Amino acid sequence: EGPALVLAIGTATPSHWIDQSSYPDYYFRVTNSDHLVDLKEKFRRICSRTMIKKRHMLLTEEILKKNPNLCSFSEPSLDIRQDILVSEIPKLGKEAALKAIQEWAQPKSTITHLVFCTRSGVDMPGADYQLIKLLGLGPSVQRLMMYQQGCFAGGTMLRLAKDLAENNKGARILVICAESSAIGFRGPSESHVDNLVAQALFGDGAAAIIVGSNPKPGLEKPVFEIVSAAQTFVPNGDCHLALHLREMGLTFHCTKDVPPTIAKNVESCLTKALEPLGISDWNSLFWILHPGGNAIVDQVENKLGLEHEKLRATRNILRDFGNMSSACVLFILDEIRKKSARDGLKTTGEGLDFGVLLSFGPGLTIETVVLHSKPI
Amino acid sequence: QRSEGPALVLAIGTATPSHWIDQSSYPDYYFRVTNSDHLVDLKEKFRRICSRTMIKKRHMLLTEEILKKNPNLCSFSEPSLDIRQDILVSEIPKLGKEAALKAIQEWAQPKSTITHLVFCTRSGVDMPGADYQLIKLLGLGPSVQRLMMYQQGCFAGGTMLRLAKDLAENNKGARILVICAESSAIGFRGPSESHVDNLVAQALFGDGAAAIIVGSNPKPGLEKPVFEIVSAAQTFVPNGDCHLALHLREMGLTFHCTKDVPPTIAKNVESCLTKALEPLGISDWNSLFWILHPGGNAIVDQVENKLGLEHEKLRATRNILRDFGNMSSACVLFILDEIRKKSARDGLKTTGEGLDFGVLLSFGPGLTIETVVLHSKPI
Ligand SMILES: *[C@@H](C(=O)CC(=O)O)C(=O)SCCNC(=O)CCNC(=O)[C@H](O)C(C)(C)COP(=O)(O)OP(=O)(O)OC[C@H]1O[C@@H](n2cnc3c(N)ncnc32)[C@H](O)[C@@H]1OP(=O)(O)O
Ligand SMILES: CC(C)(COP(=O)(O)OP(=O)(O)OC[C@H]1O[C@@H](n2cnc3c(N)ncnc32)[C@H](O)[C@@H]1OP(=O)(O)O)[C@@H](O)C(=O)NCCC(=O)NCCSC(=O)CC(=O)CC(=O)O
C-alpha cells in the first residue's frame, strides 16, 4: 500500500461572471454609490492592479435588487447570505465533483470518503450532507466537513486526504473546495477604504479531486502524488490577516505587511519540506502558488529567484477567476496539468518530476505540499 | 495486533465554566432574567420539560451580568450573533485550554511533544480559528499540524475519534491533542409562546470542554494507554435533516428537533452496532461497555429499551447528563472519562468496567450516527 495519489480533478464556476475592466462601473452603480467619485477612482486603480480579467459570482444584479442590504456596508445581511450560500455551495461542489468523477471513470458508489471545505456559509447538517444527497451517494460515505478555514485550506485538504487514503485500504476520497465571495460582498465606504481590496479580489468557484492509494492498473490514471504535506504559521499572523463572521457577513482585515511577510517566510517551509528529499534548487520544481494577490505572486517570485514562467499557471488562474480562496490551488493544479498537455510535455508537472504547492491564509498560516508528477 | 498499531486514547481531561445553575431552580432563573415572568403557562410547561430532562445542574459561560448588559440575548429573535461571537471567540479556546492542561497533566509527557491539534466546536467561528488561539494559549509551536472542525454538532465527538485514529496511525510518532469545546451561549435566547419547542433546547444544553491525547505505539513505562480505537464509522438516517437541524443566523443558533428523533435514532442504532461488531464476532450488546451521547433522556431510555441493555450499562452516560447537561460533542468524551473513573471506583479490572470491548455511539444533525468500537486497557 503506497502513497496518496490525485486521481482526477474537476472545476466549476457560477454561470454569471463579470469582467474586471468594467467592474468599477458595475459595482458603484449597483450599490448606488456613483456620487463617491474619488473612492470610485481609487477602486478603478485597485481593480487595474489586481491582474484579474474576470470573476464568476453567485450574486447577480437581480439578487442585489431583491436584497438592498447586501449593497450597504454594514446593515444586517448574514441571513440572506446564508439563504443563498447554504443552497448554492453544495450545488457548485456537485458540478465540480461530477466533472472529477467523469475523469476518474469509476462508479461514484466506489467513493468511500467525502471531505467538503468552504468558508462561505455554515449550516447543520453541513454542505457535505447536502452534497451526498445531491450526488446520489449512500449514507455510508465517511464525511468530514471543514467550515470557515480560508485561503490556505486547499493545502489543508491535501494534507487530510493523504492520511485518509493511506490508512484505509481501498479508500477513495472525494475532496471538494467550494467558495463564493457572496459571504463578504458589500457596498463601498469612505470610512473603510481597505475593504475595497476584498471587493476587487474575490470570485466564486469549486474544485474537486479524487484521492486514493494503490491505483487500479488500466482503470485509474494517477495525475499527481501527494509526497508530503505540512502546515505552519508566522507568529502574530492574526494581527495581519483575519476575517470575522458577523451580522454583516464576513469581514476582512489585511495589513500591507502580508505579502512581504509571506514571501519572507516561504523559503524555510520549502527547505523543511524538500531537504529530506535532497532538493534545494527551487527552479527544478513545478509550482502551484495560492494567488492571494498579484503582489504576493510577484514577491514570492522575486524572493525565491524563480524563473518568470514558473508561476504562469498561477497567474492564469488569477487572471481568469480571481481569488477563489481554498479552491484556487486546485484550479491551478488542473491548469498546470492542462498546460502541460498543450505544450506537448511528458509529465503533468510541466515535464518535471517534483513540484510544490504552497498556500497561505488567515493567521499567516502556510501549507506546503510536495507533489510528484505523473506521465501525461 | 501490532505495536506500531491502532490509535490509543492516552489521556482524558475535562473542564467546565466555574458558574453553574441547578436545573431545579432553572425555570425561575430563566423566566426572571429574561423578564418573562408574565408568561405563567409557558413557565409551567418549561418546568415540566426541565423536570423530565434528568439534569441536575449545568455549567454556563453566560452570567446574569452578561445577560443584563446585553438584553438582545434575552429576546427571542433580535440580532445577537455579534455579542455571541465576542463572547465565544474568546471563551471557547480558554475552556479548551483548561481541558487540555488536565489531559496533558495525566499524559505526563512534555507538551512540546504534541505534533497535531484537532479543535472541535459548534459555538462560534472565526478566522484564524480557535485552534490557532489555543496554540497561543498553551504555548505550543507554530509547527503543530492543526485541523479546525467548526459547526459540527452533537455527533462530532465520535467524528473526532474517527479523525484522530487516522492521524495517529499514518504518522509515525504523532501525538494528537483533540479538544471538543462547547457552550450553549450560541443558542441561548428568551422564551416565546410562538416557539414553544425551543424551550427544549433551553433546558438541555450546557457548557464544557474535553481533551484527549491520541497516539499509536505507546512508550513503555512513560505512557499509560486508557482505550484503543478499534474502528470508527459514520452513517445517517435518510431524510434526517427534516428531523434535526440547526442554522446559524443573525439571532444565533436555531434549533429544529421533531418528536420523531429519539425513536428514529433508537430504531437505527442496532444496524450500526451489527455493521461495526459482526467482523469481531460480537452480537451480545450486554458484553460491551457503553458510551452513548445523551442528546436527551428519552434517547437514553429508548436505546436502552430497544437494545435490551442492562440498566447499569448507561450509568456513566446518565451521570454525565445529570452533572453537566448536554455539552454537545464534548459529552461522549466526558463519558469516556467517567466510565474509566467509575471502573476504578468499583474496583473493576479494565478501564471499560472490567470488559474488553465497548462501543461509543453519538448522533446529531441530519440524524448522523457515529459508531466507535473501543477496547479497554488494564486499570
Ligand atoms: C484570502 C484568505 O486567506 C481568506 C479567505 O478569503 O478565505 C487571501 O489570500 S487574502 C490575502 C490577500 N492579500 C493581499 O492581497 C495583500 C494585499 N496587498 C497589499 O497589502 C499591498 O500593499 C499591495 C502590494 C497589493 C499594494 O500595492 P499594489 O502593487 O497592488 O498597488 P499600489 O499602487 O499600492 O496599490 C494600489 C492601491 O492599493 C492600496 N492597498 C493595497 N493594499 C492595501 C491594503 N492591504 N490595505 C489597504 N489598502 C491597500 C494601496 O494603498 C494603493 O493606493 P493608491 O490609492 O493608489 O494610493
Ligand atoms: C417527548 C420526549 C421528550 C419524551 O418524553 P419526556 O419524558 O422526555 O418529556 P415529555 O413527556 O415529552 O414532556 C415534555 C413537554 O415538552 C413537549 N416536547 C417534548 N419534546 C418536544 C419536541 N421535541 N418538540 C416540541 N415539543 C416537545 C412535550 O409535548 C411536553 O409538553 P406538555 O405535555 O407539558 O404539554 C421525547 O420524545 C422527545 O422528543 N424529546 C426531546 C429531546 C431530544 O431529542 N433532544 C435532542 C437534542 S439534539 C443534540 O443532542 C444536539 C445536536 O445534535 C447538535 C448541537 O447542539 O450541537
Numbering used by the authors:
A (entry chain B): 16 to 391
B (entry chain A): 13 to 391
Text lifted from the article:
Very recently, tropinone biosynthesis has been investigated, and it has been shown that the key intermediate 4-(1-methyl-2-pyrrolidinyl)-3-oxobutanoic acid (2)18 results from an atypical type III polyketide synthase (PKS) AbPYKS catalyzed condensation between 1 and malonyl-CoA, whereas tropinone is formed by a P450 enzyme AbCYP82M3-mediated oxidation and cyclization of racemic 2. Herein, we report the characterization of three PYKSs, AaPYKS, DsPYKS, and AbPYKS, from three respective plants, Anisodus acutangulus, Datura stramonium, and Atropa belladonna as well as the condensation mechanism based on the crystal structures of AaPYKS. In this study, we clearly demonstrated that AaPYKS only takes one-round of malonyl-CoA condensation to form free acid 5, and then undergo the non-enzymatic Mannich-like condensation with the substrate N-methylpyrrolinium to afford 2. There is no reported type III PKS that takes one round of sole malonyl-CoA condensation in natural product biosynthesis, thereby, PYKS may represent an emerging class of plant type III PKSs.
Unexpectedly, we observed an even larger electron density than that in AaPYKS-COB in the tunnel, the upper part of which is identical to that of COB moiety in the AaPYKS-COB structure and the lower part of which fills up the CoA tunnel. The expected intermediate 4-carboxy-3-oxobutanoyl-CoA could be readily fitted into the density. In the structure of AaPYKS-6, the carboxyl moiety makes the same interactions as in structure of AaPYKS-COB, and the sulfur of C166 is close to the C1 and C3 atoms of 6. To our knowledge, this is the first type III PKS structure trapped with elongated and CoA-tethered β-keto intermediate. The crystal structures clearly suggest that the PYKSs take the solo malonyl-CoA as both starter and extender unit.
